[PDB]
Amino acid sequence: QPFIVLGQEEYGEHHSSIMHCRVDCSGRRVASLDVDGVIKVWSFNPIMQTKASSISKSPLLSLEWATKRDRLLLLGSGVGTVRLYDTEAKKNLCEININDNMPRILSLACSPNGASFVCSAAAPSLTMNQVPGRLLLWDTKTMKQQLQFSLDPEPIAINCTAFNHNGNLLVTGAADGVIRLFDMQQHECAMSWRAHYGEVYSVEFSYDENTVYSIGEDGKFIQWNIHKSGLKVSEYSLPSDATGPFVLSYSGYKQVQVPRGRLFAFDSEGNYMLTCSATGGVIYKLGGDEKVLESCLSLGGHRAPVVTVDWSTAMDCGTCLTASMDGKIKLTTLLAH
Numbered sequence: 001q002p003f004i005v006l007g008q009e010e011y012g013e014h015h016s017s018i019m020h021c022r023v024d025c026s027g028r029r030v031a032s033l034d035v036d037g038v039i040k041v042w043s044f045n046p047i048m049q050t051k052a053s054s055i056s057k058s059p060l061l062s063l064e065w066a067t068k069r070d071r072l073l074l075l076g077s078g079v080g081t082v083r084l085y086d087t088e089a090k091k092n093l094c095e096i097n098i099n100d101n102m103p104r105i106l107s108l109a110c111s112p113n114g115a116s117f118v119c120s121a122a123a124p125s126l127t128m129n130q131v132p133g134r135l136l137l138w139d140t141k142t143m144k145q146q147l148q149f150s151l152d153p154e155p156i157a158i159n160c161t162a163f164n165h166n167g168n169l170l171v172t173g174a175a176d177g178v179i180r181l182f183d184m185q186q187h188e189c190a191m192s193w194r195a196h197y198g199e200v201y202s203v204e205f206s207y208d209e210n211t212v213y214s215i216g217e218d219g220k221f222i223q224w225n226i227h228k229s230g231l232k233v234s235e236y237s238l239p240s241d242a243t244g245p246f247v248l249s250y251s252g253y254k255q256v257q258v259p260r261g262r263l264f265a266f267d268s269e270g271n272y273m274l275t276c277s278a279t280g281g282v283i284y285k286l287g288g289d290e291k292v293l294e295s296c297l298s299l300g301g302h303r304a305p306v307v308t309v310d311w312s313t314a315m316d317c318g319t320c321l322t323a324s325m326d327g328k329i330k331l332t333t334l335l336a337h
Ligand SMILES: O=C(N[C@@H]1CCCS(=O)(=O)c2ccccc21)c1ccc2nc(O)cnc2c1
Pocket: 066, 067, 068, 069, 072, 074, 084, 093, 094, 110, 114, 115, 117, 140, 141, 142, 143
């Protein structure tokens, strides 16, 4: 027992499958988005209560908290817009159009220092996600686009983005299975490699930033050497219910969700990793020698597939979010022993 479970509550205000659920930078608020475009903002400590609720007219694909004003939330649409939402005032501060042919704002990342954000903007899916896309750098003070990064060999949909701790690096994963690491001072690709067969779904820097972790359509979780391009440190085949596609099956009818939100999350020091499963979050210890990753804690509590997760620590206490296709979000409190 490397953690103690202080409890597990349920936030049940969403009536459709969850797309995203992220804890804010203060560690006090959750922003969750379902597939019907409903955005909810809610606290949970010490009880669950809803601070804001709204139906988007436009489809919403992405969500990201601002780093230097806890209350601000970036939202990316399926109609080529990024909107800044004030969760305190409960109104949009602005909405910027992407003057382009790329309506799907698949990913948003706010820089740690608060001065910039990036978004990915992709062409429509094919009647596959092997479609063009762009990666945009913005200035947060003006909320204007500053530049877009060229993608090698071709424009491609970027699914996931993450900054390192200082913000000088940005790691991305794309629909072509390639990870691209950007130097955000020189505005160039410092490094790229083929990571997965099929799409990359999530990317993250290790706590120490000597590696990046990725998870992709081939069901692999891989850890890469950040100093040597494409060199693996470790590799695991996760259970297929870690990567989906996620299926909720009356008869005849089924719902199918491909990974869109964060598939993995980490404790504050990057020693443990939360993943999706059919019945709840499954936590692994990182850094082990074992050739097969063994589950060290199963949070359970779900009656439908978990499709996205988060893990936040504040006041020296961990909060795990697990979100499922029935729209339920379990919030599990963990203290480290
Ligand atoms: O809050 C504004 N920017 C902040 C910049 C400080 C750092 S932050 O708070 O972390 C952050 C993070 C992410 C986006 C913006 C900001 C902002 C700017 C320009 C605007 N222009 C309009 O037309 C309307 N609303 C506007 C609102």
